[PDB]
């Protein structure tokens, strides 16, 4: 023909994009080697969780005035409880191969993040900022910081721990935030000031899991990756950095990122920036949103669950259930379980004890 | 490497025991010819 | 066949080779071990790290 | 005195049959707890057929 | 051997899950259906066109 590769100059090779737009393009079917890339954000839900309400949206991305009560117990206001943010991104379905008992799942390999609005913090001129000294300027936003985000294919698992169990958090009302005694069903004990394996709960909703109560449970967050930071001081300065060159890899030691179960990408984040020192002396926290640039790809996996046994569970007559005696858990009425496979040379002791300290 | 069959006595072949414990044990993956 | 390792037995008898500690509970009703995983061999990648049985 | 012994092993809940010595008896009603009687299964007062099969 | 083939379960499942359709009765005692014919292959022309098989 007329390519003329020798005469035609050399131009580097880069991956081409098939489409660019909003979520609507996510419904485009692709090949196996395709790589999508999602850019999204998450506004901070920090007690005043919506600008739409007309009465008091003047404090969006803020909290009401924090101050110690002065008499036991503490009855904190919902708008003084910063909570984690969260969102789910529904991803399209993929191919499957029943004969080979394999299928495709979305894998998150790398994430690029950044805190939006950092520059907005140099506003020392707010009509109610407490002056640092007479005839001077206000006290810049500073103090406590709590930075955290998480990327995973299932909701982030959480662990509960508080600074005082005497604290009477707002009730379990639907609009109210989730607290320790919400999931337990009983007034929380002083055990909860330390770690309590019973105080666990997945991060279901938004703006309902307060920060000062919940922390990421490291034991079961295994199909997700989270990062965190903190600084605690009265007027401690706030140091933040940002760029678009920093990319974070999510792969594990085996070489896989979080797998999106239910074709859903789960993102969680929370960034407390600092206080706002009012002229009246009162104080209130503030937060900023985050940018998320997740790089997704397609991976083949083996279906670990037998289909027929799994679907039969939905039928009543095939999966019967009863309210029997406790045979599983803390009150299990089982004394021993033995598994036999293959044959070996006869051992002497039939009641083999494996632990050394026991006998 | 193998031990001398004449120098070493033989024993019976009892079914091999993989594990003994509470309820948390049933999660163990076993072969197609296992017994519980 | 002798089921118990000879050396590990006598190791129990000595306080030096079997040191003990009166620490927080890691067995019994109030144990403080949240999960234990045991890996051996290799298989094809499963589609769920939170395997249920 | 009186003895009654039974055990059942199966992959399904045991299937039962109702038979009472006297249908005149009024067993306690099922109120989110309490025994379940033929009255509870049928929704009617026990008929003298129930003394038979 | 799976007694119930999966395909039949699939349709039998989503149909109940899918939103029901309360149309005019087309099955049962008051079905609004009059004739239902079924053909297969070709035969020599029979005499009676009102034949019933
Ligand atoms: Ca774990």
Author numbering:
A (entry chain A): 18 to 376
B (entry chain B): 18 to 53
C (entry chain C), E (entry chain B): 319 to 371
D (entry chain B): 160 to 212
Which sentences did the original study use to describe this structure?
Merkel cell polyomavirus (MCPyV) is a human double-stranded DNA tumor virus. MCPyV cell entry is unique among members of the polyomavirus family as it requires the engagement of two types of glycans, sialylated oligosaccharides and sulfated glycosaminoglycans (GAGs). On the virus side, PyV-receptor interactions are mediated entirely by the major capsid protein VP1, which forms the capsid outer layer. VP1 assembles into 72 pentameric capsomers, giving rise to small capsids of 45 to 50 nm in diameter.
Using the fVLP preparation, we solved crystallographic and cryo-EM structures of the outer (VP1-only) MCPyV capsid. The structures have 3.5-Å and 3.4-Å resolutions, with no significant differences between them. In MCPyV, we observed clear density for five out of potentially six disulfide bridges that connect individual VP1 chains within the strict and local pentamers, respectively, i.e., for the α-α, α′-α″, α″-β, β-β′, and γ-α′ linkages. The crystallographic electron density shows unambiguously that only Cys25 is involved in the ringlike intracapsomer disulfide bridges, tethering each VP1 N terminus covalently to its clockwise (cw) neighbor’s CD-loop (residues 108 to 118) via Cys117, the mPyV Cys115 homolog. Additionally, the MCPyV crystal structure revealed unique intercapsomer disulfide bridges, rendered possible by the presence of two additional cysteines (Cys18 and Cys24). These two cysteines form two novel and distinct structural elements, which we term the trinity knot and disulfide handshake, respectively. The trinity knot is located at the interface between two local pentamers and one strict pentamer tethering each of the α-, α′-, and γ-chains to the respective other two. The disulfide handshake links two local pentamers whose chains run in an antiparallel fashion, with two simultaneous Cys18-Cys24 bridges (Cys18α″-Cys24β and Cys18β-Cys24α″). For our MCPyV capsids, we provided 1 mM calcium chloride in all buffers. The crystallographic electron density suggests the presence of only one divalent ion, coordinated by the Ser236 backbone carbonyl and Glu239 side chain carboxyl groups of one monomer as well as the Glu56 side chain of the neighboring monomer and the Glu353 side chain of an invading arm of another capsomer (counterclockwise [ccw]) [i.e., involving Ser236α′, Glu239α′, Glu56γ, and (ccw)Glu353γ].
